[PDB]
Design a protein around this ligand. Sequence first.
Ligand SMILES: NC(=O)C1=CN([C@@H]2O[C@H](COP(=O)(O)OP(=O)(O)OC[C@H]3O[C@@H](n4cnc5c(N)ncnc54)[C@H](OP(=O)(O)O)[C@@H]3O)[C@@H](O)[C@H]2O)C=CC1
Ligand code: SF4
Ligand code: SF4
Lengths: 198, 114, 75, 157, 385, 92, 95, 339, 178
Amino acid sequence: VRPRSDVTHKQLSAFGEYVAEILPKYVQQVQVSCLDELEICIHPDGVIPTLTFLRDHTNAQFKSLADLTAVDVPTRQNRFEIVYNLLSLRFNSRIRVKTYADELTPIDSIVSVHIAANWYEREVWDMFGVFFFNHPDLRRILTDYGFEGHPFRKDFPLTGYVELRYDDEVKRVVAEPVELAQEFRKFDLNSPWEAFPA
Amino acid sequence: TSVKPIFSRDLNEAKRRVRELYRAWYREVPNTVHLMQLDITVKQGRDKVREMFMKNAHVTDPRVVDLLVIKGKMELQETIKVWKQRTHVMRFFHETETPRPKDFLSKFYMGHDP
Amino acid sequence: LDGIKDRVLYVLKLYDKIDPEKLSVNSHFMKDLGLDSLDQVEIIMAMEDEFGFEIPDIDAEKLMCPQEIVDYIAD
Amino acid sequence: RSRAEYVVTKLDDLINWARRSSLWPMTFGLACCAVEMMHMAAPRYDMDRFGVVFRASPRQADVMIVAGTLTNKMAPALRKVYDQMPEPRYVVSMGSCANGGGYYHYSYSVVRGCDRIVPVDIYVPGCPPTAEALLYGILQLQRKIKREQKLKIWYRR
Amino acid sequence: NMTLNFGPQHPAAHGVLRLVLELSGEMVRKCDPHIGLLHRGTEKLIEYKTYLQALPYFDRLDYVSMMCNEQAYSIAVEKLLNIQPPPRAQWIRVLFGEITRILNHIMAVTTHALDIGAMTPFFWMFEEREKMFEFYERVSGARMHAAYIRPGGVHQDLPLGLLDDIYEFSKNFSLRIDEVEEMLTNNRIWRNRTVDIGVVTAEDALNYGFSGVMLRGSGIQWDLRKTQPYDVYDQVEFDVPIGSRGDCYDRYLCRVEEMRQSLRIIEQCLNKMPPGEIKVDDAKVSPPKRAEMKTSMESLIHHFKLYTEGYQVPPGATYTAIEAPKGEFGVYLVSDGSSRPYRCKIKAPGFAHLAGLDKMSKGHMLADVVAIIGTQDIVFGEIDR
Amino acid sequence: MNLYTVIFINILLSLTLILVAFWLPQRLPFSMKFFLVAITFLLFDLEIALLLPLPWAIQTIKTSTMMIMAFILVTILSLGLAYEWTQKGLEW
Amino acid sequence: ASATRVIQKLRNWASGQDLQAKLQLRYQEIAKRTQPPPKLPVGPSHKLSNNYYCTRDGRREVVPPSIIMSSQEKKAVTPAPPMKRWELSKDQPYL
Amino acid sequence: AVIPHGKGGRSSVSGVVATVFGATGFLGRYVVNHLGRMGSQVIIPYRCDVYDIMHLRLMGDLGQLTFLEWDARDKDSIRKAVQHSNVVINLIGREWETRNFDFEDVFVNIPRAIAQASKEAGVERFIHVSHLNASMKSSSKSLRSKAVGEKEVRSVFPEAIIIRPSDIFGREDRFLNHFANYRWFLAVPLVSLGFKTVKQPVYVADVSKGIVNATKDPDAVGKTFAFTGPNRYLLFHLVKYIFGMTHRTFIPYPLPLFVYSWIGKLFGLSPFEPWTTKDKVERIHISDVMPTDLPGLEDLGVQPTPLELKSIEVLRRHRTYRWLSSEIEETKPAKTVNY
Amino acid sequence: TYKYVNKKEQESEVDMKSATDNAARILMWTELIRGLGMTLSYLFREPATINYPFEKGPLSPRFRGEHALRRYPSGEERCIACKLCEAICPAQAITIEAEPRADGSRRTTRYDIDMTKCIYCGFCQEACPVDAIVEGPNFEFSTETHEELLYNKEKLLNNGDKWEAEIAANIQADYLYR
Ligand SMILES: NC(=O)C1=CN([C@@H]2O[C@H](COP(=O)(O)OP(=O)(O)OC[C@H]3O[C@@H](n4cnc5c(N)ncnc54)[C@H](OP(=O)(O)O)[C@@H]3O)[C@@H](O)[C@H]2O)C=CC1
Ligand code: SF4
Ligand code: SF4
């Protein structure tokens, strides 16, 4: 069983309250995991304001953006859950600010607050389809130039719909609808028995 | 209802943007067919542009339209700032794939699940 | 101006869909000769070439009859 | 010996020896298999010894080792580089990522094999196909190049 | 600024990078790196695989640092389960964690030189690399792509005799680093092509999320291994090699210095590795020993369920970051109660570094761009994921 | 003639190779810096010329004038270089 | 190794280092193969007594995240104590 | 038989196991392409070294293309190739009578033995390909010999389809490249100054698709289809047009054929694949026959494709940097001759 | 603990002697000559390369190499088709379908390892209860055609019979560790 120090779960908890108090217009929920990690949750409109306070506040300097990601809970009305993980080299602590964005309700861009996000925001658009206003140059980064569809969405087939082969007749690479020679065997793995109350 | 506007307050304003993109593509088709040495006819290509711009003619919601041009603009950028080579462009024409008939009798004769 | 009008008519005559017969300086293809919204935009584009003059959409949308085109081309 | 057949067998044996002894490898350095060859180029298993030069520009390149996954964004390129290589040319597909899709077979962004994009001569198996294993594969290309009898076919054609 | 589309010309490699650029003659006006030439789906594929069958993906994410990456997923899965590895396993992971850092730096310093044009350092140190691989093989079975560091500790104890050889090598490797030095650290020419090229300010490095030697080279003192200790990197003693006048030459010197400091950490690990088990004793998380599964029913049931279904991690989400040789490697692993993960964004030290290429290579010549891609140790696997 | 004999063999040897080589198998890159260099190059190349007769001129009876002349030429060109350095020229 | 002394001396000098002492090629110093059979140690939890799993299963004793500030005088508090400045090394401060 | 399952693309099954003896050819390449695309089992008998048939491997899927070593003189090789095929397609042909193979062999002798065995095997259908306008009396030995074959094979294999294509238009074809390559020649000889030899080209693919469709259609038995084209042409426009797209000067100068047959004889003497053939020459000035016959394209399901449409791709390699970017629209079209 | 690399502790004021030493370093390329000495030194060292066909780079018992299916000494193939080797394969490589053999025993009618799909993780070696599927030592199985790489039960069983003697020795050496 991992060793857990409650010093952190107390320090981080307090900070959470501090952030919440300072930014009550946007903070909806602020929780600390059992793993000693804080996760302020903000209304999408608070993207710019909450980050800026953390990047430039003496009692909470969160200078670098570790990551910007978007889990996709299809059930959730607001499908995407943009999560921004930040690090404070001054206070040696990380916080995560997570917002919610639906497919056609764009989030603001923080390239202003952290220029690290210039690329990750393009990554989130390419994979999940969330759009970021005021982004300097939003354009697909990881997917092919002509790719249609946002791949990491839970509703996108793994194999996808198009695959490439070289055709002599046309002497050029050519998409064709995917035809797989051994479909992905979809093993069902969930057991019908729960583990604990959680 | 009660939705927030992405970039266009109403289908009207949005349509303005579509007009601009159409023009953009229309003016660009010829250049691509020459800078990519594509074996297509400018007229032919320009019809394709029309095809696509109408494939999505049914959309009534302003927000959906706005994203559609954002995406459309991005595609143009990849074809005028050329990062998309012929293989990419010609794919639009679906040149190699064999067309599938939509006639019931046709499908019956060929596929288990139509 | 008549020559300009001829240029306008000339362009239209060239466009495929437009029917030379229905064509008249008072024809409004958007509503009369049956040209689609997108087609009207395309027409303006050809005019922009023939007349080497650029037309903003705001105004271009307003131009749906050849004569109207002539009028704008005029100014 | 005296026979137009014997002279045409010996001379290809000569032509085949030259191509076999000096194969310059063009290494599409995709993924990690490129490292497992950078180890072949390195001192434990020198490739130069065998006449295979460390690196030659595509235009100068008798073999193409495709190491690593061929995504659907690099495919259109591989074909170009294969198409721009000089005629006598051979392809060695290294890695379960390249000869077949390997882990990442079912991905939407990975071509399931480079055989779909470029004709492949020897398929070297293994996630990081070992460096001797590539060296065995390059030596197998040399056995394939010895067997080829182009002059004999032209004579009896 | 005639776009040259350089990089599909295999000129700096490190993977396949189409660095579309606009160059007024030999001066670079703007660099827009293109990525995804190696996107393969690693993040989506993992959602369809169980925790233990997604471990091999992490070795492939950035395969020059094969294991260090595995430690990041391990740690992450251990946190979610609130399980910790046994004491011997921790030291192992730090032992092979460091050996891996050397392997990455030998790659980064020598491959940097090959693009610059110095070719003999690569052959000198690839022989040492080779010798290290053999450690991997005799511990895992694979030269690279081992799968040795699993979510609950190591897979199998070290062979009976490895430690001694990881000593002979370490006892000598120094001289090998020393040699490279006598060839490049003070070359009258290495300095020129490297010094004052790609200087990055301290404030800008934190802003663009550089988080690696790239920060350390600018003088910011941050080693996640000292600031936020993971495993038993706390019990060892090493000196972070901070740099000043951050530029390609200074950071280099830093990478040669961590090669040196890692030998200090490896020595200790050999001197103080404890007797013990190498995997958690919870058959719940770690697979049962094969003698046990072949003689005890509870062990077979636990072997069958673990291999066929999985850990069944409790629902939660964590971002755990280690100090991979390139920089901060972190896995944000959201997890439902299921045996297969829900999301696993891999933070790649490299997605941030490439982005900086634009703000680093400004008003620079074609050769400068080649030098800067080297000073970022870009492995396109981690960036493309 | 002796040279002519050698040279034509020299061309023949090369033309032979290329011929067999082809028979056996059976837009705006401009930087003033580059132009500027070419120019400087000739200004220096011309000077090389005015300096080439120096081996014959060494034996000139004058000697004093020879050196006085040669030293002036080398010094004035070098000053040309000096101003090239001082100006952005030679600073690519 | 196996180098005539003179070559070694030239080697050591040209390199500036006693490369002979630390040769890269391995000779009869590497662990012999077929090292003896290993009897590895069994860890904790193998006790046959007082080994109840319920008392050793951190996997699911974990609880749902603690929640603060849910939507459904006071001193300032930092994310954590301000970090402590690292200290220059003592074996080799510089270089 | 093999029930056809799948969606229609590679990695799917169509149930056509087909020996195709002359696949390495220009037409062949295309035949294997569609057969492979459709998912058919294709056995490719080959004689040239493996290096040359690599271009066929990526076509078709794994275990869908099988290559067998085969010698025309050796009857046994043909025997085993058709052992397990149910469709045999014969594209064996050449323009230059080679030292060890005469026009008879390549057209009539060999293509007989082949279908002969195919019957012994019990192949459902055999498709034999012979040149268009092939009289048993036509001037060119080639055409006449081909005619001789289409007869014989009918006795070895009754109800064997006999598609009879015109000279083919396609990248890597001769009809179009040959003329374009006259550039090397300062002057481009044209018998009768390229007149009175109206010609109707047909795109290679059209021919291929047609051939493939034959394999999978009961309507074609004993049918002698004629894939022709979408427009005829006096050789004059064709020649100039070509030179037009190639953007190289066109200098039509008439040359008495009697003398020209001699020029063909000259290159014909060439050891390495004579570029022109006495038998070629005649063929080139052999007027295309009229279209009154079992229709081919369209009849078999593919609408012909006009020459001008794809000419740009076939003739592009012959242009110079100056004209590379130039496009079809810039150039003019040639004129047809219903005559 | 930190360490400054490339930080000049202080400003040594130029002393003629110092200046000369430096100027000589630039003028007579002294450090460049230092670098040449290092390479000349190795030229005299023994090269580390191995004759690849004649000598082979050492691989210890755990090397995963090429898949093989083992058989009991009696001659009964070890696999009993529990099919969890299929379950834990990360790449979906192994395909197994089974039916009760005439003897009544459980056996696999078809066992197909797609080696191009396989990423040689070695978990199958791990997972098998009877340890029927093992990672065999051979790494040299490069094949001219893609189909040869796909392996059915007969190739793997044959691979198992050919390398059984070494596989048994390798498993013998490493089983205590596992
Ligand atoms: N313009 C055209 O192409 C037209 C063609 N046709 C007919 O269509 C058929 C295909 O034409 P095309 O592809 O251009 O012909 P090619 O010149 O391309 O050769 C076709 C194939 O026949 C094989 N072949 C030729 N001679 C022999 C032989 N003696 N023994 C074994 N195989 C042989 C060749 O194999 P290899 O190269 O390995 O020897 C080649 O793969 C021909 O038979 C021709 O009569 C009809 C009208 C027009
Ligand atoms: S094959 Fe294994 S090693 Fe080679 S690239 Fe694909 S994954 Fe990396
Ligand atoms: S696990 Fe071992 S035994 Fe069970 S099926 Fe796979 S191979 Fe046969």
